[PDB]
Amino acid sequence: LRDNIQGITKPAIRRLARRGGVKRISGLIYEETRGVLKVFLENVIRDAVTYTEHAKRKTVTAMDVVYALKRQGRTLYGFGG
Amino acid sequence: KVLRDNIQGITKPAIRRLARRGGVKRISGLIYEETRGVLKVFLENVIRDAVTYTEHAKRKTVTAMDVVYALKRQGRTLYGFGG
Amino acid sequence: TRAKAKTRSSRAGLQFPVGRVHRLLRKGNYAERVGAGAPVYLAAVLEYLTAEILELAGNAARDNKKTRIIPRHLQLAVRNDEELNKLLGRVTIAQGGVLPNIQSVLLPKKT
Amino acid sequence: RAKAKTRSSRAGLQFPVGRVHRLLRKGNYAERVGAGAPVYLAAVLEYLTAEILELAGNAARDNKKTRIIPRHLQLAVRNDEELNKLLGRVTIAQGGVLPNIQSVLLPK
Amino acid sequence: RKTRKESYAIYVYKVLKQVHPDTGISSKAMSIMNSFVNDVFERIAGEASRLAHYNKRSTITSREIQTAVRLLLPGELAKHAVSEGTKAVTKYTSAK
Amino acid sequence: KTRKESYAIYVYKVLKQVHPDTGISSKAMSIMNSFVNDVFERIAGEASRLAHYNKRSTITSREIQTAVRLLLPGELAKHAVSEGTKAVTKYTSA
Amino acid sequence: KPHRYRPGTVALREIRRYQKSTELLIRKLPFQRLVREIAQDFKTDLRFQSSAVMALQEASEAYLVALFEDTNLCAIHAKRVTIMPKDIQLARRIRGERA
Amino acid sequence: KPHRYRPGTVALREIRRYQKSTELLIRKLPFQRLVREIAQDFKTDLRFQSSAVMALQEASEAYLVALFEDTNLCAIHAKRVTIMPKDIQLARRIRGER
Numbered sequence A: 001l002r003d004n005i006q007g008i009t010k011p012a013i014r015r016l017a018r019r020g021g022v023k024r025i026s027g028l029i030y031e032e033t034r035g036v037l038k039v040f041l042e043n044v045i046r047d048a049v050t051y052t053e054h055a056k057r058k059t060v061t062a063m064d065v066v067y068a069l070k071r072q073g074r075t076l077y078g079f080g081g
Numbered sequence B: 001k002v003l004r005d006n007i008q009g010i011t012k013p014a015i016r017r018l019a020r021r022g023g024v025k026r027i028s029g030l031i032y033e034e035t036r037g038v039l040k041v042f043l044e045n046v047i048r049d050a051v052t053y054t055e056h057a058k059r060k061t062v063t064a065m066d067v068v069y070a071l072k073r074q075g076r077t078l079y080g081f082g083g
Numbered sequence C: 001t002r003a004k005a006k007t008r009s010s011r012a013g014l015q016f017p018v019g020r021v022h023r024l025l026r027k028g029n030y031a032e033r034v035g036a037g038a039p040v041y042l043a044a045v046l047e048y049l050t051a052e053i054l055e056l057a058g059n060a061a062r063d064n065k066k067t068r069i070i071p072r073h074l075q076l077a078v079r080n081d082e083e084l085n086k087l088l089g090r091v092t093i094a095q096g097g098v099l100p101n102i103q104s105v106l107l108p109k110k111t
Numbered sequence D: 001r002a003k004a005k006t007r008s009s010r011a012g013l014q015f016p017v018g019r020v021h022r023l024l025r026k027g028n029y030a031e032r033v034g035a036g037a038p039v040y041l042a043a044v045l046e047y048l049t050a051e052i053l054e055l056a057g058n059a060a061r062d063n064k065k066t067r068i069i070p071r072h073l074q075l076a077v078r079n080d081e082e083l084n085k086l087l088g089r090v091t092i093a094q095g096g097v098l099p100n101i102q103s104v105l106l107p108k
Numbered sequence E: 001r002k003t004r005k006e007s008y009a010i011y012v013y014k015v016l017k018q019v020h021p022d023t024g025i026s027s028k029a030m031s032i033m034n035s036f037v038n039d040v041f042e043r044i045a046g047e048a049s050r051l052a053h054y055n056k057r058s059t060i061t062s063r064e065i066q067t068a069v070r071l072l073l074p075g076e077l078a079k080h081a082v083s084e085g086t087k088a089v090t091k092y093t094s095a096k
Numbered sequence F: 001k002t003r004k005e006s007y008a009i010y011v012y013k014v015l016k017q018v019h020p021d022t023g024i025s026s027k028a029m030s031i032m033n034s035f036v037n038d039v040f041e042r043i044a045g046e047a048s049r050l051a052h053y054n055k056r057s058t059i060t061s062r063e064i065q066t067a068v069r070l071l072l073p074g075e076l077a078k079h080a081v082s083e084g085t086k087a088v089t090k091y092t093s094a
Numbered sequence G: 001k002p003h004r005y006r007p008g009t010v011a012l013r014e015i016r017r018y019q020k021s022t023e024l025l026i027r028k029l030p031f032q033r034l035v036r037e038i039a040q041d042f043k044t045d046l047r048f049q050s051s052a053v054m055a056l057q058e059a060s061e062a063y064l065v066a067l068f069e070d071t072n073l074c075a076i077h078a079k080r081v082t083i084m085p086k087d088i089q090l091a092r093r094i095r096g097e098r099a
Numbered sequence H: 001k002p003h004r005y006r007p008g009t010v011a012l013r014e015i016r017r018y019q020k021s022t023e024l025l026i027r028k029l030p031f032q033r034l035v036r037e038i039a040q041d042f043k044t045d046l047r048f049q050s051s052a053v054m055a056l057q058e059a060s061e062a063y064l065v066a067l068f069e070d071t072n073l074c075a076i077h078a079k080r081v082t083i084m085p086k087d088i089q090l091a092r093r094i095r096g097e098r
C-alpha cells in the first residue's frame, strides 16, 4: 500500500510530457512529478472527502470532485455540474 | 484637455525602486518599456472594471470601494479601503 | 383563463427557457426580488454564448470531416478562439486534451 | 423581565453574534439561518483575528513598537506559512513584501 | 423510481440545429455544454447578486445582469452579448 | 450621517485580550476590518454553496464547520474547528 | 541493415501523436489505487463512483499537461530542451502553488 | 579621485533599503495622470476619490513588485542576474495573463 505512487509509471509521465510538448526528459523529472501529482491529489481528495463528510455519505460522487476542483479554481466540465 | 503620454510618468527610477522591493539586483534597458506596458494593461483591466462598477452605481466618481470590488473580483483582494 | 399559453422564450424571441432560468434565479438565493428582464436577458446571453461555441465546434467538426461534435471539438473551439480562452483559461474540458502546439526551438533545423 | 445577556457573552465569545446573524440573514445565503452557525462563525473569526493580532503584536515587539502598523500585519501574515496559504492572493496595503534576498545575488 | 434531473440538453441541441442543421453532438460534449451553461449561469447570477448587495438593492433586473455580462465576458464578446440581450429584452417588452 | 458599521472595537477588544499594552493604528484597523469582512464573506459563501449542493435551505453549524475546514489550511482549520465547537458547546449549555 | 532514427524525430513524432490524441495516458487501475491510497489517510473505508475517479484522472492529467507546458517554457527559456526539476519548481513557484 | 563603490554593493544596499520601507515608490501625481488617461478611453469627465487612486497605487505597486519577484526568479533560473523582457514574458505566461 506504498508503491501506489509508483503506479504513475515512467512511460505514463513521458506520455503526459509528450502531450505537454516536452522533447527531452531528465531522469530526476519522474520522482518530482509523482510528488507534485501526489500533492495535487492530496488537496483535491482532501476537499472531496470533506464534501462527502458534509453529505453524511460513504461514497465520493463525481459531483464532489467537480465541486472540489471548482473550489480550487480548476473547473472541470463533463461530469454533471 | 485630452490627457496623453502619461505612461512616461512612470519614470525609470520608480521602476528601479519597484525592482529593488522585488529583490532585483540588475535591470536591463528594455525592462522599463516592458514594465510600462504591463502596468498599462493591468490598469486597463482594473480601471475598466472600476469604471463599470461606477456605471452601474449611477455615479460619475470612482470610489475606493469600486476599485476594491474590482481588485477583489480579479482575485487580488486589497485590504485597507473596505470590502 | 382563456388565452394561448405563449411561453416567455418565444415571447422574447429566444430558445433557452425564461421560466427555468427565472426559477433558478429565485431558488439560487441571489436576491429577494428577481425581475423578468433579468431572466430574459440572461437566457439571451446564455443562448448567444452557447450558439457561438456550438458554431465554432461545428466548424472544427467540419474541419475534422465529422458531423458529430465530440469533446475535442469543443476543446479546439474554445482554445483556438482568444476570447473564449480568456473566458475559460482556468477551466478544464474533459476528453479534450490540448492544442497541437509545438515550439519553434524544439523543431529540427530544416534549412 | 430578564437580564439581557448577549449571545456573545452567552457563547463565551467577543465578536457580535447578532451582527454576524443579521449579516447571514441579510447577505442572501440561504432561507433559514440557525444560531449555532453565527456562534460558530463568530468563534472562527475571533480565533483568526486573535492569532493574527498575536503575531502582529509579536512583530511590533520585535520592531520595538507598541502600535500595530500595516507593515506589522504584513510580516505577521507573510512570515506564517498557513496565513500565507490563506492570504496568498491578497494584497495588504502599506505593507510591502518580506525582506527576502536570494543567495546567488549576494557577493561572494 | 421517479426523479428527473433537469438539464439544458434539448435547448443546446435546438440552438445547435439552429446554427448547424446537419451537425450532431455526442452525450459527453452535451454534458460539457450543460456544465458550461450551468457554470456561466452561476457566474453571472453570482456577480449580479454581489452587485445588488454592493448597491444596497434587493431586486435583480436586466441592468444588473447587463453589467455582470459586461464584467464577465472579455470585451467584444461582452459587447455582442449586451446587444443580443438588449435586443431580446426589447422584443420581450413589446410582444403579444 | 448614516452609521457605517465596523468590527473596529471588537478587533481592539481581542487585541487587548492578546496584547494588553500594544495598540493599533487606524489604517491597520481598516486592514483588520477588511480581513474580517473578507473571511466572513468567504465562509458564508462556501457555506451557502454547501447548503445549495445538499438541497438544504438552513445554514447550521455543520455548514460553517465544513466551510472552515475547506477554507482554512490544515492546522488553522483544526484549531478553528476546536475553538468553534468549544464556543457552540458553551452556547448551547449556558 | 537495422534502421534507427535520430532522437529528435521520434520525440517530435510522439509529441505530435499525443497532442493529437485525447485518451487518458495514466492507466485507470494504478491511478485508482493511488486515489484510494491518498484517500485512506483521510477516512477509512471510502468508496468511489467510477465517474469520480475518471473526473480525478481527467483533471490530474490536464493539470500535469499544463504543468509540463510551463516546464517546457522554463526549459526553453533557460536555453535548454531538456526539462529539469529546476523547471518544475520555477513553474510551480510562479503559479503560486509552493506551499 | 573620490570613493566609488562596486555595482553589487549599492545594488544590494538598495534592495535592503526598499524591502524594509513601506512607502509608495511611484509618485502620486504622474500615477494619477496615468489613471485619468486610461479612464478617459472609457468615459469622459470621470472623477476620482483620493483613496481610490491611493488604492490603485497600492495594488499596482504590489502587483509590479510580485511581477519583479517572479521576473528575478526567471532571471536567476536562466543563470543570470539581469532581468529581461524574456523573463517578464515568461513570468506573465506561467501566471496565465498572456
Ligand SMILES: [Cl-]
Pocket: C035, C036, C037, C038, E061, E062, E063
Ligand atoms: Cl428588468
Ligand SMILES: [Cl-]
Pocket: D034, D035, D036, D037, F059, F060, F061
Ligand atoms: Cl445551528
Ligand SMILES: [Cl-]
Pocket: A028, G084, G085, G086
Ligand atoms: Cl534539478
